[PDB]
Design a protein around this ligand. Sequence first.
Ligand SMILES: NC(=O)C1=CN([C@@H]2O[C@H](COP(=O)(O)OP(=O)(O)OC[C@H]3O[C@@H](n4cnc5c(N)ncnc54)[C@H](OP(=O)(O)O)[C@@H]3O)[C@@H](O)[C@H]2O)[C@@H](O)[C@@H](O)C1
Ligand SMILES: NC(=O)C1=CN([C@@H]2O[C@H](COP(=O)(O)OP(=O)(O)OC[C@H]3O[C@@H](n4cnc5c(N)ncnc54)[C@H](OP(=O)(O)O)[C@@H]3O)[C@@H](O)[C@H]2O)[C@@H](O)[C@@H](O)C1
Ligand SMILES: [Mn+2]
Ligand SMILES: [Mn+2]
Lengths: 403, 403
Amino acid sequence: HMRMEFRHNLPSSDIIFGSGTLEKIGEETKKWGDKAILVTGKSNMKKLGFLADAIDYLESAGVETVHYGEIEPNPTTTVVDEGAEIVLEEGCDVVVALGGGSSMDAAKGIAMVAGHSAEERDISVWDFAPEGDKETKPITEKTLPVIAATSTSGTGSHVTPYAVITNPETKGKPGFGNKHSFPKVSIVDIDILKEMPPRLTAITGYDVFSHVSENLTAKGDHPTADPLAIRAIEYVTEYLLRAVEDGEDIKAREKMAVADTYAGLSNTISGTTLRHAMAHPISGYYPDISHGQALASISVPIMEHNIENGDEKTWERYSRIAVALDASKPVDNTRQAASKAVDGLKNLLRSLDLDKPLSELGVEEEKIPEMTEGAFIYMGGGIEANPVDVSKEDVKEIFRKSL
Amino acid sequence: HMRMEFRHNLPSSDIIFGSGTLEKIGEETKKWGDKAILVTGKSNMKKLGFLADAIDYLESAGVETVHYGEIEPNPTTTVVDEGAEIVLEEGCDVVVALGGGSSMDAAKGIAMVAGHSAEERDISVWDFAPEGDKETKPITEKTLPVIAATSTSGTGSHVTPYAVITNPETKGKPGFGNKHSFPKVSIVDIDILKEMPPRLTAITGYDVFSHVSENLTAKGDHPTADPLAIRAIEYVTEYLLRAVEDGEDIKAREKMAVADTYAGLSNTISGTTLRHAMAHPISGYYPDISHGQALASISVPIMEHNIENGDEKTWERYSRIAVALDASKPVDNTRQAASKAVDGLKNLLRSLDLDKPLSELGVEEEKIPEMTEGAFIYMGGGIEANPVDVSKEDVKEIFRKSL
Ligand SMILES: NC(=O)C1=CN([C@@H]2O[C@H](COP(=O)(O)OP(=O)(O)OC[C@H]3O[C@@H](n4cnc5c(N)ncnc54)[C@H](OP(=O)(O)O)[C@@H]3O)[C@@H](O)[C@H]2O)[C@@H](O)[C@@H](O)C1
Ligand SMILES: NC(=O)C1=CN([C@@H]2O[C@H](COP(=O)(O)OP(=O)(O)OC[C@H]3O[C@@H](n4cnc5c(N)ncnc54)[C@H](OP(=O)(O)O)[C@@H]3O)[C@@H](O)[C@H]2O)[C@@H](O)[C@@H](O)C1
Ligand SMILES: [Mn+2]
Ligand SMILES: [Mn+2]
């Protein structure tokens, strides 16, 4: 028998789940600081009034708050480094995020730069970011505390250590972070998430699926992630299209937010693999391409590559994904059983109108070697976590079949 | 639709799983202190040589080690308070446990008393222990760090905050603890666990089952515990009897240790209910009664009481336990579907020869009001977590049907 061996690492988590739990953001932030920077996008939290509420709760708590409403989707290094300067100029001591993955990741990055800076700065968030064998600057407990109120049922970021930051100079979009950048408190407010439009629901829903299906097939044993990852796929199958079709379907919103929370916990314990490794350089080189659509448009060729070069242990995992996707009934450890996950994936992608080749999003064949070097330089952990090897041209071939 | 609302709290966890992972106990302890007290039972870790190994690894690391090999099953306050005096006399700075729940709980208690003491003591572990409305002494970060190497696939204690300590004066056996008594590092070594005798395997295996089945039916929503709790019951059904019948069945040992780890994580997030509340006063008043046999001997009347006074939401949960116990195929939310969990429980109890009335263990009817007051005074959280109310005589009646 093959001995099972793993190390499970999961930072402390504190999750406040329910509708109206934004009311708690002030009291919880005060436990961690007296002067918050509130990190949000530019318009949607404002428009739907949750921004005003959050400011009200923080200040009614008695947390002085500087609003940084500058985060655009796929946050950049300049937006993070500028946010940290505001932290250092105003003497903020806790970073609060209200927004999707882009805001929560910018928030964690601001926490990192600002906690490790001198008085004015002398460091960039890129110093923490993987870049080939470049020795990264260690992320330490100096990282400012982060409070995360998520507004998407998508990235898991309210319960992960990771920030995903794009350098516009190199187009890298790596992820980085550890126990010191994991949010001290995570607020999941159904009243915010139920305002996601249909298409944002579907994109971020597919991100939930992408995490847990990759977490399950990552190389090695990771049993503590697996029941959460499986339950998440089962909730995606049962509830994501319900949420896309009726945003006011509260049970469907709750299950997607539970599933999104499973995915963050699962992505912390396990890790993503080749699908994320190649999806990030897509948003790096094409910053208006959603992360969840980049994932969707390359999923079928990658899943088919992993099954074809896999083994019995990997196939069994893909077979369990197929059962959870309702594309199959019995779990088995064969190439054929694993292939039904490809059938289930295509149905999911079709039900959510995510099945689009990379050409339809604006990606051009000329950018293949650029993105391929992007995946290995900035997402090397994902390539190494993939259940099968991929060479540099393995990845270029995958990109082209996704075209 | 019924809105879902919960708060999830899970302290940082670091789990080293595999065979031969006792080799890591020294390096990991050194990260937390230079002078450990090693908290073990009296004979079995010594006899099987893991005690010598642990001392060797700790000192070969360079951790000076004082052995406290005095823990008897169902640890008492005097054994904890005496262990803390040795900590304070020798200036130990990290508490290391190698043993079952009894050693890990004694270790956490030693960490608490010794971290909150003056120079010689002036405090008992009982000061931290629930006792009716007695204001308990707060358990703070002063708690010494705890390294836990478990030797049973039973209590979950290597990944819970809780210590269960008996006061011989009152016979109370409450549990207590929080984030500051959760082990900094948890080592799960298949080579130690595979030495559990058959009967200890079955007893501690049923403890694994008791945690997750109670965690699933505890009042309120607790979605982050549930997939782990379900997977644990599925592993108990598939592998516990294999482990009892062949202790060298390594796959069965691994799955039980994974299941035991699920149960600790799940018992931290959720909580136990009436079965544990009444099982503890049994070991409190009868200290040679195993915790897992006390649980077993009262399980059928309690599960039948919770189903009979339950609702659709509770019944659905018991129905999922029945499916996971292989006693049923479809999940439904009816009294009848939930009742098949009682059929599945009896099969499990019969396959492990745990089906014994309280009379067969030595419990006498005269002790019912004593144990009943024990459950409410010392295990009030479990009674309140139970999905249905129980009055003081509800509990006395349950005890008598278990006789
Ligand atoms: N830290 C982590 O663990 C991970 C984070 N990731 C990264 O997360 C980012 C994507 O985040 P998402 O949450 O999907 O969406 P964004 O934060 O970019 O916002 C996109 C648009 O949606 C809007 N939005 C968010 N919640 C809304 C709501 N309730 N109602 C209406 N609109 C809402 C946003 O409005 P704003 O522009 O005002 O911010 C934005 O326009 C990407 O940059 C991705 O790379 C992923 O890579 C992920 O796998 C891992
Ligand atoms: N802190 C927590 O979260 C919980 C701990 N609990 C508490 O845990 C204690 C029971 O622990 P267990 O692990 O089941 O067993 P014990 O620690 O008492 O040891 C019992 C006997 O088994 C022996 N043993 C343990 N591992 C062995 C091994 N690999 N091979 C051979 N023998 C082994 C032990 O040998 P020693 O006497 O030398 O210690 C002991 O005699 C009870 O006191 C229980 O109340 C439970 O209440 C539980 O629900 C919650
Ligand atoms: Mn993602
Ligand atoms: Mn127990």
